[PDB]
C-alpha cells in the first residue's frame with residue numbers, strides 16, 4: 138500500500154510557531170480569554186480515521202518542522218514515548234524513504250508496540266529498531282541505559298529526535314532532556330554532527346521563567362489546535378546552544394485561545410471506512426455506518442429484545458448503550474455547523490443529559506464517542 | 519467622461535460582518551464570554567476609508583454583502599434611504615446595483631449634510647436620485663415626524679420593500695418614534711399595503727440594554743455586527759419586518775460577536791486608490807499636505823510652520839503622528855497591530871486632547887493610506 142495515498146486520511150494541521158528571540162519583546166500585550174462551556178474532548182472531532190493512536194492528527198513533521206526536515210535530510214528518525222506510533226505513521230506517509238528507531242516505555246498502561254503504524258503502513262519493514270527484547274529500564278527515556286542502547290541497530294546521528302512521552306513531574310522531563318544532551322555530546326556517532334542536533338518534545342507549560350538545562354536552547358514553541366483545550370500542552374523544538382527559558386503558561390494560553398476562537402478543524406480529505414466501522418463497533422458493539430434514524434432505532438430495538446453473572450448486573454451495560462444512542466440521536470437531529478469550539482459549545486449546551494453522559498462514560502469511551510460524533514458531523518450535507 | 523458605477527466599486531473596501539439570525543425557538547443555550555482588552559484610543563475603523571471625504575458609511579455596511587439574497591429575491595426597482603447624510607452608503611449601493619433608482623431623505627439642519635455630496639462625487643450626477651427631498655421643511659425630513667412618511671411617495675410610486683436607515687437618534691424613544699411611523703405607513707399606505715408583510719427596514723441601532731421589546735407587529739429578522747463599527751460601542755444593524763414582535767439585540771450578544779471580528783479578522787484595503795479623494799483628505803487634515811507622504815514631505819511641513827500658536831500646535835501633533843507612522847514597521851490591518859502603533863507612540867493622550875473627533879477620523883484615513891502604501 139502507497140504511503141502518500143494513505144496521507145489523505147490524516148487531517149490538515151493548524152498551529153502557531155513562537156520563534157525564540159534573543160532580543161526583548163518591549164510590547165506589554167493584553168490577554169485573550171474565552172471560557173468555552175465544554176466537558177467533552179472535542180480535539181478528537183477530526184480523528185475518526187484512526188483507532189489506537191491519533192497523535193498524527195495533532196502534530197506533523199512536514200507541517201511544523203518541514204524546512205528543518207528538508208535542510209538536515211535525516212535518513213533515520215528517532216521516536217521516543219511514541220505509544221501506538223500514529224505520529225510516526227504520519228511521518229512515514231509524508232517522508233516515504235525515512236527509516237525509524239522506535240522506543241516506548243514497556244508497561245501495561247497504554248502501548249509499547251506500534252499498532253497504528255502496523256495499521257496505516259501495513260508492515261514494520263521501515264522500523265529498523267522497534268525495541269524488541271529490551272527491559273522496562275532500557276525503554277524509559279529518563280534512564281541512561283535507554284540512550285546507551287539507542288544505536289544498537291541505527292548508526293545514524295540523532296539529527297531529529299521526536300518525543301511525545303507523558304511524564305509525571307517536570308523533573309522527569311528534565312531527566313530526559315539532560316540525558317539527550319549527555320548523549321548527543323558524548324556519543325561517537327552524534328558528536329560528528331556537532332551542535333546541529335534537535336529534540337522536538339511535548340511539554341506542558343505550567344509555570345513561567347523556568348530555565349532549560351545547561352547548553353539546551355529552545356528554537357521555537359508550537360501550539361497545536363489538536364491539543365486539549367483545558368491544559369497548556371505545547372511542542373518545543375530544542376537544540377544545543379546557550380540555554381534559554383521554557384514556554385510560559387501565559388504565551389501558550391493566548392496562542393491556544395486565538396486558535397480556539399478563530400480557526401476551524403479541518404476534516405480528512407478521504408474517509409477510512411474500515412477505521413470508522415472499527416471505532417463505531419469499539420464505541421457500541423454492532424454499530425454500523427451510515428448512522429441514521431433507522432440505524433439508531435435498531436440499536437434501541439436490540440436493547441429492548443435483550444431485557445425481554447447476574448441478570449441485574451447486565452443493566453449497567455444497557456445504561457451505557459442508551460447514553461451513547463441518546464447522544465448520537467442528538468447529533469443527528471442537530472443542525473450542521475462548522476467544526477469549531479463555538480459550535481461544539483452549542484452542541485453540548487443543547488443536550489439536556491450532559492452531566493449524566495460524563496458520569497456514565499469513561500475517558501476512553503468519551504474520546505471514541507467524539508471520533509464517531511466528528512464522522513457524523515462531517516457526513517452531514 | 520463616462521462614469522461606470524461597477525468600476526467605481528473598486529474604491530470601496532471589502533466588508534467583514536456577522537449575521538445573528540433571530541430564531542422563533544425561544545431557547546438559547548448557556549455560553550461563555552470572549553474578552554480581549556485592546557488598549558486603543560483612536561477610531562481605527564476609518565483605516566480602510568481613505569478614498570472617501572464627506573461620508574464613508576459604505577466602507578462599513580453594504581447591501582450586496584449583508585442582504586444580497588433579499589436584494590435578489592425582492593428585486594427592488596427603487597430603494598428608500600433615510601438619515602443618509604452625504605449618501606456614501608447609497609453611493610456604494612448605486613455601484614453594486616447599477617439599475618436601482620433612489621429616494622433620499624436626511625434631516626435639514628446646519629449640524630449635518632442634508633444633500634448627497636459623496637453620492638455626487640462617486641456617481642457623478644444625481645440622475646438616479648428621483649427624489650432628493652428638494653423643497654422640503656425640516657419637519658418633512660425628520661424620520662420621527664409623520665409628515666416625512668406621508669410625503670415619501672411624492673415622486674416614487676414603488677412600495678417601501680427595503681428602507682435603509684443610518685440616522686443617529688438622541689434617545690431610543692426617537693428610534694422607536696421612527697420604527698412606529700415606518701409600521702404605521704407600511705400598514706396604511708395604498709401603494710405599500712399591496713406587498714403585505716414582506717416589507718423591510720434595515721436600521722442602525724445601538725444595543726444598549728437587554729430584553730427590550732420592539733413595537734407591536736415589528737419583528738427583527740437578523741442582527742448585523744460590522745467590523746467597520748467603532749470597537750468601543752455596541753452599534754449594530756438590525757433587519758426588521760412586519761410580524762409577531764420580538765426583542766431588540768442585547769448588549770451581551772453583540773459584545774462577543776463584536777470581539778471575535780476584532781481578534782480574528784483583518785481590515786481589507788480598497789483594490790484601487792482614489793488619489794483625488796486621498797489628496798482631499800490630506801489637505802483637509804493639514805492644509806498643503808501632498809501625496810506621497812515621506813520624510814521629505816514631512817520635513818517641508820515642519821519648515822513651513824516655522825514662519826495663532828493654537829493652529830501650529832495642532833499641526834505639530836499631526837506631523838509627529840504621521841512621522842511615527844512612517845518610522846513604524848509595516849504590519850497587517852488589525853487591532854493587534856493598531857494597539858502596537860499607539861503603544862509605541864509616547865504623546866498618545868496629548869493627541870486625543872489636541873484634536874477633535876472629526877480631525878482624528880481624518881488622521882486615521884491618512885494613517886490607513888500610509889500603512890497600505892508601505893512595501
Ligand SMILES: Nc1nc2c(ncn2[C@@H]2O[C@H](COP(=O)(O)OP(=O)(O)OP(=O)(O)O)[C@@H](O)[C@H]2O)c(=O)[nH]1
Pocket residue numbers: 178180187188189190191192195220363364365366500501502504505
Ligand atoms: N487526552 C488527550 N489525548 C490526546 C490529545 N492529543 C493526542 N492524544 C493522544 O490520544 C490518546 C487517546 O486517543 P486514542 O489513542 O486515539 O484512543 P482511545 O483508544 O479511545 O484511548 P485511551 O485509552 O484514552 O488512550 C491519548 O492517550 C494521547 O496519547 C489531547 O489533546 N488529549
Ligand SMILES: Nc1nc2c(ncn2[C@@H]2O[C@H](CO)[C@@H](O)[C@H]2O)c(=O)[nH]1
Pocket residue numbers: 561563571572573574575578603746747748879
Ligand atoms: N463607523 C463610524 N463612522 C463614523 C463615525 N463618525 C463619523 N463616521 C462617518 O464617517 C465619515 C468620516 O468623514 C463621517 O462623515 C460619517 O459618515 C463613527 O464613530 N463610526
Ligand SMILES: [Zn+2]
Pocket residue numbers: 288294295320321324325326327328
Ligand atoms: Zn548517538
Ligand SMILES: [Zn+2]
Pocket residue numbers: 671677678703704707708709710711
Ligand atoms: Zn408606502
